[PDB]
Design a protein around this ligand. Structure first.
Ligand SMILES: O=C(O)[C@@H](CO)OP(=O)(O)O
Ligand SMILES: O=C(O)[C@@H](CO)OP(=O)(O)O
Ligand SMILES: [Mg+2]
Ligand SMILES: [Mg+2]
Lengths: 439, 438
């Protein structure tokens, strides 16, 4: 019983970037108090660990987290008092067993994750290390790299009234030489995009979505991609910025007919029937985009359980980074399935989707051992917490998507990444290297 | 000793709009204290000016590498070894080091970052939370949780709609504590979002710089109707009031002395009565007030239309009339308003003056006159929560720091909740906005 021992655990309800309640957890040791805030997704894969919400329709539209907070204060916290914060896997497993359900739906994945993260922060202080460095040592990473940031810039799918099927288009400065330059390139390109959008779609078209990007009324993906090429060109960075696409294809998939409708939002009398695609037709569409635009990466190109489609795309078009999101939900068992089936070559990491840091590390290890890409990710409902910045560096993931360069729940991560780079001095930048290893 | 400045270091970060700003770290025996500075003006006639690089090829000329260099190589060395507890002495030292009235040599941004981090280091030296240290420093024996006022609808230069005014805010003056105030506003905002989607479409729920919506309304009445509807849907009629920021300088014609409430309306669709003289404008404001629960009006007239401000304040002595552009957090402008009886409330934007010491003085002047005092965000904010501790410790009783949306806004509201939780019994301002010396 010493400085490393938990003396106090306390949670409270705060508001996330969308203005909905979420939880923050504070853990106190001899090194001080350590705070973590938990994010939350606007739309969530059917397989995620589950956040506990109050369901009281008279309070915050039923989205309160008083129950999760009490769970921390009167259940998890009491069980953590006196324990050693250095024992990350032991404490995470203890909370998993308290809950007793595979989806963490009893105590709430949000309650558990908040404790998991603050335990980790307290431990880094105990070792006298910055968080990213503690994360590296905890996970056996002898090398660290600044990740390529991918910035949401144009929205579609369920997030916009435009005709655009895909959920988002991102810009990724793979050609930058360091992180502060990468951020500057994206910020400049984002401002050029804002100008182009204002001129073409009007002032109000530059108001922003949840993640800081724009939702102009484009006719489809080609018009959206043209806008990105135009902005990158105005910024002067052609050939140094690439494009990532998140299709979120489950959103426009018809399980019964096996069809993907790229015109779901288009009025019948204006709807090209060619927009309703079978897998081969959807594949050809993606390949066409790839031929005409610098698209490096495609996330959720097919529905969350269309394994055959994922496999075909992966072995027949492996030149793309192919990212499982809704497919994998940061869940090691899903990752194992995807590896056996050879269904993708990259995984998105959303910590709150699995609910503990220990399980997150395992997901990342599996991916890195296979040489898959690993992209740390924000949620639509973010907070002023910067944890994932340290996580992406410490675990050497090499990619992060955490928002447009707009809205501070996004900038706070990018600012932290710049600090980490400044502090390290001679840390390399990932550039066009996305595939991971366990080194 | 642990009070002595051992290290001063600044770097360039991005603000909530994606533009560069500065953050400053000061290290003492108590640890490292970081402050982020919100973005402000680099030009203008009365306010302190931030320093920008003006390199067109970098961040569109908006870099702050020069301000950063000023902190690291000029202000920092002048601070080394100094006692953080001496706020006024250090602020005055920096003011003299810059040597210009508007801090334009070193930059108000460079100076303020230092001022704030000195203050945080001092609070730690005294073993106090920031808000409490601030109260002690400024002689406030009583603290109050402020009424938060939240941006909800945008007009003027911030929207393509016909709405003349820059923004409407909602203010939960009928809440009983701060946690409840925030919830009321969050619920109302979500209700408004639903209403706007139904009436104007999904894309009309995308948000502006401060988290509010820009629905294509025809004018003030349509906007006010949406707010009253949202408030009723949330179930808080009579407990939420409306603040109107006209930013009237935006639609003032200096040659004709007219205020055009239809600047954005095409000539052939335009009601001719929309172009008003001062009396006509006053009449319009009075009419909104008769039909809607409007509790305050910010910049109702142009930034130098003293006669109009005085006329309005005299004819409505009891009603909150807030100076923003009129005053720019500037003690000399505040004094002029007091001499002319031009208004009865002041916005406080710390970066518009540049040091905490001068900020304390502007607030003190207003409190001695029984004026309203409203701590305010900037359009380009950061993840820094300083103004939350500031508004509580200085007993200002009002704060406007965004819609309940975008974390550069929520981080302040979240911090305000923490302060209330920590204090326990602290009163909520409610309908009491006029400050006092108590
Ligand atoms: O959908 C996504 O990929 C991400 C944000 O880019 O998260 P979310 O689930 O919360 O929307
Ligand atoms: O326009 C304004 O009146 C205010 C509102 O926050 O500030 P700024 O200059 O930051 O825009
Ligand atoms: Mg996705
Ligand atoms: Mg204003």
């Amino acid at each position: 019983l010493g400085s490393m021992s938990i003396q106090k655990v306390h949670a409270r309800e705060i508001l996330d970037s969308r203005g909905n309640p979420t939880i923050e957890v504070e853990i106190t040791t001899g090194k001080g108090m350590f705070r973590s805030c938990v994010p939350s997704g606007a739309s969530t894969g059917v397989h995620e660990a589950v956040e506990l919400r109050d369901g009281d329709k008279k309070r915050y539209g039923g989205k309160g987290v008083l129950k999760a907070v009490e769970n921390v204060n009167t259940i998890i916290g009491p069980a953590l008092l006196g324990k050693n914060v250095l024992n990350q896997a032991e404490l995470d497993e203890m909370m998993i067993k308290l809950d007793g359900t595979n989806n963490k739906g009893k105590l709430g994945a949000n309650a558990i994750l908040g404790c998991s993260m603050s335990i980790c922060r307290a431990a880094a202080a105990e070792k006298g290390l910055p968080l990213y460095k503690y994360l590296a040592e905890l996970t056996g990473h002898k090398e660290m790299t600044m990740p390529v940031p991918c910035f949401n810039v144009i929205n579609g799918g369920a997030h916009a009234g435009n005709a655009l099927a895909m959920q988002e288009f991102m810009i990724c400065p793979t050609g930058a030489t360091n992180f502060h330059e990468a951020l500057r390139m994206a910020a400049e390109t984002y401002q050029c995009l804002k100008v182009v959008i204002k001129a073409k779609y009007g002032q109000d078209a530059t108001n922003v979505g949840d993640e800081g990007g724009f939702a102009p009324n484009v006719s489809g993906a080609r018009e959206a991609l043209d806008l990105l090429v135009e902005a990158i060109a105005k910024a002067g960075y052609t050939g140094k910025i690439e494009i990532a696409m998140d299709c979120a294809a489950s959103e426009f998939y018809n399980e019964e007919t096996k069809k993907y409708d790229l015109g779901k939002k288009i009025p019948a009398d204006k709807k090209d029937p060619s927009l309703v695609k079978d897998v081969d037709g959807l594949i050809a569409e993606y390949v066409d985009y790839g031929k005409h635009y610098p698209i490096a990466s495609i996330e959720d190109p097919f529905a969350e359980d269309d394994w055959a489609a994922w496999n075909k795309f992966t072995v027949e078009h492996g030149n793309f980074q192919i990212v499982g999101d809704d497919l994998l939900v940061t869940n090691p068992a899903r990752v194992q399935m995807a590896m056996d089936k050879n269904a993708c070559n990259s995984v998105l990491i959303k910590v709150n989707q699995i609910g503990t840091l220990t399980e997150t590390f395992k997901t990342i290890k599996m991916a890195q051992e296979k040489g898959w890409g690993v992209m740390a990710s924000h949620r639509s409902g973010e907070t002023e917490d910067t944890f994932i910045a340290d996580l992406v560096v410490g675990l050497n993931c090499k990619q992060i998507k955490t928002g447009a360069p707009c809205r501070s729940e996004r900038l706070c991560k990018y600012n932290q990444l710049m600090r980490i780079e400044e502090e390290l001095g001679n840390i390399p930048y990932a550039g066009k290297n996305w595939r991971n290893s366990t080194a």
